[PDB]
Amino acid sequence: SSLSVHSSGDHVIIGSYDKRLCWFDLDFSSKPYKNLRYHSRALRDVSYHPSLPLFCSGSDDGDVQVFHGRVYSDLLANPLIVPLKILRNHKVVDNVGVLSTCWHPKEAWLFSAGAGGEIRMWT
Protein backbone atom coordinates (compact mmCIF):
# COMPACT_ATOMS: atom_id res chain seq x y z
CA SER A 1 0.00 0.00 0.00
CA SER A 2 2.51 2.65 1.12
CA LEU A 3 6.14 3.06 2.13
CA SER A 4 8.22 5.41 4.25
CA VAL A 5 11.98 5.96 4.50
CA HIS A 6 14.07 6.60 7.60
CA SER A 7 16.09 9.81 7.34
CA SER A 8 19.24 7.70 7.67
CA GLY A 9 18.25 6.21 4.31
CA ASP A 10 18.96 2.59 5.27
CA HIS A 11 15.52 1.69 6.64
CA VAL A 12 12.15 1.34 4.92
CA ILE A 13 8.67 0.56 6.26
CA ILE A 14 6.17 -1.19 3.99
CA GLY A 15 2.50 -0.77 4.80
CA SER A 16 0.53 -3.43 2.98
CA TYR A 17 -3.06 -4.25 2.11
CA ASP A 18 -2.31 -7.65 3.69
CA LYS A 19 -2.76 -6.09 7.16
CA ARG A 20 1.01 -6.30 7.57
CA LEU A 21 3.91 -3.96 8.30
CA CYS A 22 7.30 -4.93 6.86
CA TRP A 23 10.47 -3.28 8.16
CA PHE A 24 13.25 -3.42 5.57
CA ASP A 25 16.85 -2.73 6.59
CA LEU A 26 18.90 -2.19 3.45
CA ASP A 27 22.06 -3.63 4.86
CA PHE A 28 20.26 -6.53 6.58
CA SER A 29 18.83 -8.67 3.86
CA SER A 30 16.68 -8.58 0.77
CA LYS A 31 13.92 -10.16 2.86
CA PRO A 32 11.99 -7.95 5.31
CA TYR A 33 13.88 -7.60 8.57
CA LYS A 34 10.62 -7.64 10.55
CA ASN A 35 7.02 -8.47 9.68
CA LEU A 36 4.23 -7.26 11.97
CA ARG A 37 0.57 -8.31 11.87
CA TYR A 38 -1.03 -6.38 14.73
CA HIS A 39 -3.61 -4.63 12.54
CA SER A 40 -6.95 -6.42 12.26
CA ARG A 41 -7.83 -4.80 8.91
CA ALA A 42 -6.06 -3.64 5.76
CA LEU A 43 -3.19 -1.26 6.46
CA ARG A 44 -3.43 2.02 4.54
CA ASP A 45 -0.48 4.27 5.38
CA VAL A 46 2.80 4.21 7.30
CA SER A 47 4.69 7.35 8.34
CA TYR A 48 8.12 7.80 9.92
CA HIS A 49 8.93 10.84 12.02
CA PRO A 50 11.65 12.73 10.11
CA SER A 51 13.79 13.26 13.23
CA LEU A 52 12.50 11.24 16.19
CA PRO A 53 12.78 7.41 16.05
CA LEU A 54 9.00 6.99 16.06
CA PHE A 55 6.66 5.74 13.35
CA CYS A 56 2.97 4.95 12.95
CA SER A 57 0.70 2.72 10.87
CA GLY A 58 -2.87 3.76 10.05
CA SER A 59 -5.36 1.16 8.85
CA ASP A 60 -9.06 0.88 8.03
CA ASP A 61 -9.81 -0.79 11.38
CA GLY A 62 -9.75 2.70 12.92
CA ASP A 63 -6.76 1.93 15.16
CA VAL A 64 -3.40 3.68 14.79
CA GLN A 65 -0.35 1.71 15.91
CA VAL A 66 2.48 3.86 17.27
CA PHE A 67 5.83 2.06 17.32
CA HIS A 68 9.25 3.19 18.50
CA GLY A 69 11.88 2.31 15.92
CA ARG A 70 15.38 2.89 17.26
CA VAL A 71 18.36 2.80 14.87
CA TYR A 72 22.07 2.78 15.61
CA SER A 73 24.73 2.92 12.90
CA ASP A 74 26.68 0.20 14.74
CA LEU A 75 26.55 -3.11 12.89
CA LEU A 76 26.32 -5.26 16.04
CA ALA A 77 23.14 -3.48 17.18
CA ASN A 78 20.12 -4.44 15.13
CA PRO A 79 17.42 -1.74 15.14
CA LEU A 80 15.01 -2.02 18.07
CA ILE A 81 11.39 -2.03 16.90
CA VAL A 82 8.86 -1.92 19.74
CA PRO A 83 5.19 -1.00 19.98
CA LEU A 84 4.45 2.02 22.10
CA LYS A 85 0.74 2.87 21.86
CA ILE A 86 -2.50 1.67 20.28
CA LEU A 87 -4.57 4.74 19.42
CA ARG A 88 -8.25 3.82 19.32
CA ASN A 89 -11.74 5.39 19.41
CA HIS A 90 -11.89 6.41 15.74
CA LYS A 91 -15.03 5.68 13.73
CA VAL A 92 -15.06 3.68 10.49
CA VAL A 93 -17.23 4.88 7.60
CA ASP A 94 -17.98 2.76 4.51
CA ASN A 95 -15.33 0.22 5.60
CA VAL A 96 -12.76 3.04 5.59
CA GLY A 97 -10.94 3.95 8.79
CA VAL A 98 -7.69 5.81 9.45
CA LEU A 99 -6.58 6.51 5.88
CA SER A 100 -3.63 8.90 6.32
CA THR A 101 -1.18 9.56 9.15
CA CYS A 102 1.49 12.27 9.31
CA TRP A 103 4.24 13.15 11.78
CA HIS A 104 5.17 16.54 13.16
CA PRO A 105 8.55 17.69 11.78
CA LYS A 106 9.95 18.37 15.27
CA GLU A 107 8.04 16.70 18.13
CA ALA A 108 6.06 13.47 18.55
CA TRP A 109 2.71 14.74 17.30
CA LEU A 110 0.48 12.68 15.01
CA PHE A 111 -1.89 13.99 12.34
CA SER A 112 -4.46 11.28 11.61
CA ALA A 113 -7.22 11.75 9.02
CA GLY A 114 -10.37 9.64 9.14
CA ALA A 115 -13.11 8.83 6.66
CA GLY A 116 -15.63 10.97 8.56
CA GLY A 117 -13.73 14.21 8.08
CA GLU A 118 -12.14 14.08 11.54
CA ILE A 119 -8.49 15.04 12.06
CA ARG A 120 -7.17 13.77 15.39
CA MET A 121 -4.17 15.23 17.21
CA TRP A 122 -2.34 12.50 19.11
CA THR A 123 0.19 14.29 21.30
Partner: peptide
Protein backbone atom coordinates in the same frame (compact mmCIF):
# COMPACT_ATOMS: atom_id res chain seq x y z
CA UNK B 1 0.14 0.77 29.88
CA UNK B 2 2.81 -1.84 30.61
CA UNK B 3 0.43 -4.82 30.56
CA UNK B 4 -1.13 -3.60 27.31
CA UNK B 5 2.30 -3.11 25.74
CA UNK B 6 3.31 -6.64 26.74
CA UNK B 7 0.12 -7.86 25.03
CA UNK B 8 1.22 -6.56 21.62
CA UNK B 9 4.90 -7.25 22.38
CA UNK B 10 4.32 -10.63 20.72
CA UNK B 11 6.55 -9.92 17.70
CA UNK B 12 7.75 -13.49 17.10
CA UNK B 13 10.67 -14.99 19.12
CA UNK B 14 7.99 -16.92 21.08
CA UNK B 15 8.69 -20.04 18.94
CA UNK B 16 5.76 -21.25 16.81
CA UNK B 17 2.32 -20.79 18.38
CA UNK B 18 3.36 -21.76 21.92
CA UNK B 19 2.45 -18.98 24.38
CA UNK B 20 -1.27 -19.15 23.53
CA UNK B 21 -1.23 -22.67 25.02
CA UNK B 22 -0.62 -21.34 28.53
CA UNK B 23 -2.77 -18.24 28.03
CA UNK B 24 -5.78 -20.27 26.88
CA UNK B 25 -5.48 -22.98 29.55
Amino acid sequence: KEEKEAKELSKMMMSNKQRKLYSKL
